[PDB]
Amino acid sequence: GSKKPVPIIYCNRRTGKCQRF
């Protein structure tokens, strides 16, 4: 894992809340 082409993001459709780490 050298480059970061795709970051990490979570989303809770249960409460409508997402964000990227």
Side-chain angles (χ1 to χ4, degrees):
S2 269
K3 286 216 280 130
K4 286 149 251 258
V6 190
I8 39 176
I9 126 75
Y10 91 98
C11 193
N12 249 306
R13 60 230 310 167
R14 298 295 177 171
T15 175
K17 287 185 162 276
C18 337
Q19 139 180 122
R20 256 205 228 70
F21 309 67

